[PDB]
Structure formats: structure tokens, C-alpha cells
Design an enzyme around this catalytic site. Structure first.
Site, PDB file in Angstrom:
ATOM      1  N   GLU A 260      40.295  36.629  38.775  1.00 55.57           N
ATOM      2  CA  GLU A 260      40.815  37.905  38.677  1.00 55.57           C
ATOM      3  C   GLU A 260      42.116  38.241  39.427  1.00 55.57           C
ATOM      4  O   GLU A 260      42.156  37.916  40.766  1.00 55.57           O
ATOM      5  CB  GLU A 260      39.825  39.067  39.082  1.00 55.57           C
ATOM      6  CG  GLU A 260      40.404  40.548  39.068  1.00 55.57           C
ATOM      7  CD  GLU A 260      40.154  40.702  37.419  1.00 55.57           C
ATOM      8  OE1 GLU A 260      39.796  40.019  36.609  1.00 55.57           O
ATOM      9  OE2 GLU A 260      40.663  42.050  37.028  1.00 55.57           O
ATOM     10  N   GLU A 290      50.306  43.654  36.199  1.00 58.83           N
ATOM     11  CA  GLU A 290      50.442  42.178  36.458  1.00 58.83           C
ATOM     12  C   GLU A 290      50.827  41.398  35.308  1.00 58.83           C
ATOM     13  O   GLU A 290      51.841  40.485  35.575  1.00 58.83           O
ATOM     14  CB  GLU A 290      48.965  41.956  36.684  1.00 58.83           C
ATOM     15  CG  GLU A 290      48.558  42.243  38.165  1.00 58.83           C
ATOM     16  CD  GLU A 290      47.039  42.196  38.668  1.00 58.83           C
ATOM     17  OE1 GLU A 290      46.345  41.986  37.511  1.00 58.83           O
ATOM     18  OE2 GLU A 290      46.771  43.208  39.254  1.00 58.83           O
ATOM     19  N   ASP A 433      38.295  45.227  38.672  1.00 57.08           N
ATOM     20  CA  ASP A 433      37.243  44.166  39.185  1.00 57.08           C
ATOM     21  C   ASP A 433      36.072  44.506  38.347  1.00 57.08           C
ATOM     22  O   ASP A 433      35.565  43.377  37.980  1.00 57.08           O
ATOM     23  CB  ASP A 433      37.202  43.967  40.715  1.00 57.08           C
ATOM     24  CG  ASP A 433      38.537  43.972  41.261  1.00 57.08           C
ATOM     25  OD1 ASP A 433      39.501  43.167  40.998  1.00 57.08           O
ATOM     26  OD2 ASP A 433      38.859  44.756  42.398  1.00 57.08           O
TER      27      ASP A 433
END
EC number: 2.7.1.146
Length: 450
Positions: A260, A290, A433
Site C-alpha cells: 500500500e 498517487e 487502506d
């Protein structure tokens, strides 16, 4: 439905997130401790990190009067005791991707959840759920203990502190009265050296392969805590060579590995992590911010700017394909507000439908946690089923079809579902997450079946 027979190891980032309510008595008592013109002088000079208590009050009260949130790094370990002696905490909870992931999995009651962080003081250890194991060396051999009981006295203590301020409050900085315009949070992030040595410590290192025999998958995260350079001459590269060694130990034991990712502001460190970690693991979890950060350091600056500016499904599908093609791990999962996506190689054993079902488990699990604030037992997953697929779903589906028309899909399977969006949740921290944990858990279940 819950693949309860799977066993997962998570490392390396776990920390305490602690919340303080700034009411009147609390803020005035704090200001009172300082010389008013000393405080004023420090505001105008504008400290960009917290070394001393006066940095903290200065940055805070500047933030309080503007009424605008702020995050400021704590770069001096010795401040932990000052904070702790000055304030009372509304709440201390578990934070850090590995921590959150471990607690979510142990809440699902899977067969075994082992968590690792190099820094485990009692105060951190007790914030994990019952059921999470921690590996220790005992009598020269590997043993697992309940993590709450595995703490090392004196370990470095990573604590991020969120100061909540609500509109209405007035205090005084000498004679000058000061009312707070808006609510908000002032966040003080642990960013001192001792908690940046992200690794498997040397005592446990020789037993990693023995740990590997006990799990079907490992979820690695927290690389973003590394610094460029360390006091004792170590550097990011030093820790990244150790990180590679850990990957090798688990993969030799047929463990599948999920990384992750996270926001890494330093482009050079971001580049080192991508280079050192991503091509060597199996599964990778990213968000939309990201994707652009990665593309940007891989050289695709135009496409990264387009993603950041316009957030289109098509540019993310292209950019995900590029990242997979360049880095050559096994499967990429992208999480976005309105849609999750998987991109795999053409020879991935899972069908499109199983890939969809894995994503669906991820967004469901996350919606559950966003509604309840915590996964207590496996039935809690079902609460996520009460959160519908978002109102953009049909448009997501239409745009996916248009995207497939424009873009190549020879070498890649691409699967997109809409999210079970929770507007304004009890819990914001760590939803990404939790999506990845559920997605990867079921991805393992389907592979094992294949």
C-alpha cells in the site's frame, strides 16, 4: 463470504493518533505559560517545524486566529513528554497503515493476523485489537505473543496529535482578544529520526522466512517514513536494501505481497521507493493522487498533470497501464472517490467477475468501517451492504465503455466498479487502506481457489 481461513502478516507502520480538544481553559492555560511578545515575535518569524514549545504555541495560535487548518512536523523526540505532561487526550487510537490493516483483519476474525512494527512501546501495543499477534525472539527462537503483551519498554514512541478547535471560542494573547472564525484541526506529526528507521529489526530478521511459512499474504507499507539521511551515516538506500531482503524471505515461502503506497513529498525518496519496492512485490494499492506522483517520477509529466487537473477515468486507466507495464509487478488496484479499478496482466488466473467481486468486497468493507468506525466482528461487513453504489455509477459505466474504445486493452485486464460512497463518515482516516485490505484478502482467496 469472508475468507476466514487466510492468514496475513502486515508491517511496518503503526503509531498513536491522539486528539486534544482546545476549549478556553486549555488554550489560555497554554498561552499563559509564555511571554506574549516572545510568542508574537515567533509567529512573524514563522517556524515550519516544531523543535521547542514556543514553535508549537506560535504555529497553533497563528492557525487559531486565521481559523484555517494546518499540519506541522514534530522533529524533536523529547517533545513527546512535554505534550503528554501539558495536555489531556480526548482519545488515543491506532494509526499507521499496518496498524489499521491489522485491526480491520483481526476484526474480520480471519485465521491469523500478525503485525510488525520495529517500535512497540506499551502505549502503542494496547491500541491493537485482541487477536493480533506479534513475532518476538524468545530463548533464541521465534515465538508469537499477543501484541498487547509484546511491548518493549523504552521503544521509540510515534504519536501524531490532532488539536481540534471549534468556532466561537475566544482567548487572549496578552491584551489582544482573539476569536476563532471556523472549526478545524492543528495536526502535529511525528517526524523525528528514531521513528524513521523503518525496517525489520535485526533480532527478528533471521526468522522472517519462518514467519512466512505461517501466512498466505503479507501487506507492506510505511516506506514513506524513511528519511533521506540518518545521524549514524545510514540513508534511505540502506533501509531499502533491508526492505528488499524482507520481500525475498516472504516470496521464497510463496507468500503473495501487497504494498500500500502513500504520499511521498520528496520526489527523490519517492523515486527510490518505487524503484526499490514496487517491481518486486505482487499487488500494489494506489489512490488517484498517487498515480500522478508515480507517473511524474517515471517521466510521464504531461499525463500526471492531466490526472491531477481533470481526474478523468480514461487518463487513470492509461496511467495505471503505464505503471504496470513499466514496473512489472502482478496487479494494480486504484482507489478513487467514485470507482475502484484493477489492472492485471492478460494471464492473471482470475476472471473479470472475480476481480470485480474482490473490489466489491473492498469498497463494502470500507463503507462498513466508515459507517461504524471500527470492525468488531465479521457480521459488521454486512453494514457496508446498506451503503448503495454511488449516484455517479451509471456515468462511471458509460465512461468506462468510451475509454475502452479509445485505449488499448491487449496486454491488460481492466476492471472498474463504482464505490459504495459514504458522504460524511464517522471515520475518515485509513479508508483507502481498508479498501486494499479487503481487495487483497479476496484476491488471495480467489487465487488459492485457482
Amino acid at each position: 463470504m469472508i475468507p476466514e481461513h487466510l492468514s496475513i502478516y502486515t508491517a511496518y507502520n503503526a503509531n498513536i493518533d491522539a486528539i486534544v480538544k482546545l476549549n478556553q481553559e486549555t488554550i489560555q492555560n497554554l498561552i499563559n505559560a509564555f511571554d506574549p511578545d516572545e510568542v508574537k515575535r515567533r509567529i512573524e518569524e514563522y517556524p515550519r517545524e516544531i523543535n521547542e514549545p514556543i514553535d508549537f504555541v506560535a504555529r497553533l495560535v497563528h492557525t487559531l486566529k486565521l481559523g484555517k487548518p494546518a499540519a506541522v512536523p514534530l522533529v524533536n523526540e523529547k517533545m513527546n513528554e512535554w505534550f503528554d505532561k501539558t495536555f489531556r487526550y480526548e482519545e488515543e487510537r491506532l494509526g499507521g497503515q499496518a496498524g489499521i490493516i491489522a485491526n480491520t483483519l483481526a476484526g474480520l476474525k480471519i485465521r491469523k493476523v500478525i503485525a510488525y512494527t520495529p517500535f512497540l512501546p506499551k502505549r502503542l501495543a494496547e491500541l491493537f485489537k485482541k487477536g493480533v499477534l506479534y513475532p518476538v525472539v524468545e530463548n533464541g527462537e521465534l515465538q508469537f505473543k499477543p501484541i498487547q503483551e509484546a511491548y518493549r519498554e523504552g521503544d521509540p514512541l510515534k504519536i501524531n496529535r490532532i488539536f481540534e478547535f471549534r468556532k466561537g471560542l475566544k482567548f487572549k494573547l496578552g491584551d489582544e482578544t482573539i476569536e476563532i472564525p471556523n472549526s478545524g484541526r492543528f495536526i502535529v506529526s511525528a517526524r523525528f529520526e528514531s521513528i524513521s528507521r523503518i525496517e525489520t529489526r535485526e533480532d527478528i530478521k533471521p526468522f522472517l522466512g519462518e514467519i512466512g511459512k505461517e501466512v498466505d499474504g503479507a501487506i507492506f507499507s510505511g516506506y514513506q517514513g524513511l528519511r533521506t539521511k540518518y545521524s549514524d551515516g545510514k540513508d534511505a538506500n540502506y533501509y531499502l536494501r533491508r526492505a528488499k531482503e524482507d520481500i525475498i524471505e516472504f516470496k521464497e515461502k510463496d507468500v503473495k505481497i501487497h504494498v500500500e503506497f502513500a504520499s511521498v513529498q520528496d520526489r527523490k525518496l519517492r523515486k527510490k521507493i518505487i524503484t526499490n519496492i514496487l517491481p518486486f512485490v505482487d499487488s500494489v494499492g494506489i489512490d488517484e493522487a498517487e498515480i500522478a506522483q508515480i507517473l511524474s517520477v517515471l517521466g510521464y509529466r504531461e499525463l500526471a498533470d492531466r490526472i491531477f487537473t481533470y481526474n478523468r477515468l480514461e487518463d487513470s486507466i492509461l496511467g495505471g497501464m503505464i505503471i504496470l507495464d513499466e514496473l512489472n509487478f502482478e496487479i494494480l488496484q486504484v482507489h478513487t472517490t467514485y470507482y475502484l479499478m484493477y489492472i492485471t496482466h492478460r494471464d492473471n488466473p482470475l476472471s473479470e467477475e472475480e476481480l470485480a467481486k474482490s473490489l466489491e468486497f473492498g469498497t463494502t468493507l470500507a463503507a462498513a468501517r466508515a459507517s461504524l468506525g471500527d470492525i468488531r466482528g465479521p457480521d459488521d461487513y454486512k453494514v457496508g451492504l446498506k451503503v448503495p453504489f454511488n449516484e455517479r455509477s451509471e456515468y462511471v459505466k458509460l465512461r468506462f465503455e468510451e475509454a475502452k474504445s479509445r485505449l488499448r486493452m491487449r496486454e491488460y485486464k481492466v476492471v472498474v466498479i463504482p464505490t459504495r460512497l459514504v458522504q460524511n463518515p464517522v471515520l475518515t482516516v485509513g479508508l483507502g487502506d481498508t479498501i486494499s485490505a479487503g481487495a487483497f484478502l479476496t484476491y488471495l482467496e480467489f487465487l488459492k481457489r485457482h
